[PDB]
Design a protein around this ligand. Structure first.
Ligand SMILES: NS(=O)(=O)c1cc(C(=O)NCCO)c(S(=O)(=O)c2ccccc2)cc1Cl
Ligand SMILES: [Zn+2]
Length: 257
């Protein structure tokens, strides 16, 4: 039932998912001036050499690229984390226009889109168990701006025609997520939540400072997807982002400056 419209969008979610109004909700505005530099923070370790993508699915909220997470093949560690998190999926949030679409903001600035690489803590054995724990997930968030194309994104953009509507899925193998990363791994980090129902408070957020640029034609192709299922009235999949939530009793830490 939940989604992103006037009658079922973010402002409604708390009815079905009361944690919506909880103490560590995501996303947030990152006020770069009040973020605390922490010189005890380690470089982030992104080991994506042997990642195995399996598929791509339109779930009627976004598209998820799924990975085989049955072995330590694509892992995040270091940075603020204790131990090892395995990549399960990535997806994006984006706008109807280039001036909005990101979930986190930087000094109130909205980017065209935001990439989420979702990982789970191996101490909990799998994803379903991890989401029930306060340190279960680490999500690496990367901002997209419109400018030069990202060559490494094009394989994703080119398959979207095949998964236009809610419930459609395609085989999607040999996709290399390293091609979606910016040069720098400087980051902000804070404890928060899933940004979509069920909104569970289980995420260590790691948000990269450096955006990637993607072309207008690449993001235009994301906007051709549909929230509706095949043979329902067409509703373009745009503005699938939750706005900034109250920081409450949290400090955002920076790995830089
Ligand atoms: N946005 S996010 O905080 O990185 C985030 C987004 C989703 C998500 O896929 N949501 C559905 C569409 O985005 C998930 S999920 O647990 O795989 C899930 C899938 C489908 C429906 C609900 C939930 C986990 C995280 Cl951590
Ligand atoms: Zn997300």
């Amino acid at each position: 039932h939940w989604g992103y419209g006037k009658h079922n969008g973010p402002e409604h979610w708390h009815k079905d998912f009361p944690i919506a109004k909880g103490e560590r909700q995501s996303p947030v505005d990152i006020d770069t001036h009040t973020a605390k530099y922490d010189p005890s923070l380690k470089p982030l370790s992104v080991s994506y050499d042997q990642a195995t993508s399996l598929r791509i699915l339109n779930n009627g909220h976004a598209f998820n690229v799924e990975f085989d997470d049955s072995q330590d093949k694509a892992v995040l560690k270091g940075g603020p984390l204790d131990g090892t998190y395995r990549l399960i999926q990535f997806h994006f949030h984006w706008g109807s226009l280039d001036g909005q679409g990101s979930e986190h903001t930087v000094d109130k600035k909205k980017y065209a889109a935001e990439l989420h690489l979702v990982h789970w803590n191996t101490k909990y054995g799998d994803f379903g168990k991890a989401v029930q724990q306060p340190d279960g997930l680490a999500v690496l968030g990367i901002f997209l701006k419109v400018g030069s194309a990202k060559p490494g994104l094009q394989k994703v953009v080119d398959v979207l025609d095949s998964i236009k509507t809610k419930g459609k899925s395609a085989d999607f193998t040999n996709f290399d997520p390293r091609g979606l990363l910016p040069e720098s791994l400087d980051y902000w980090t804070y404890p928060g939540s899933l940004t979509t129902p069920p909104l569970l408070e289980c995420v260590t957020w790691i948000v990269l400072k450096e955006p990637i640029s993607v072309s207008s034609e690449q993001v235009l192709k994301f906007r051709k997807l549909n929230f509706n299922g095949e043979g329902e009235p067409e509703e373009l999949m745009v503005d699938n982002w939750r706005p900034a939530q109250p920081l409450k009793n949290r400090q955002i830490k920076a790995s830089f400056k």
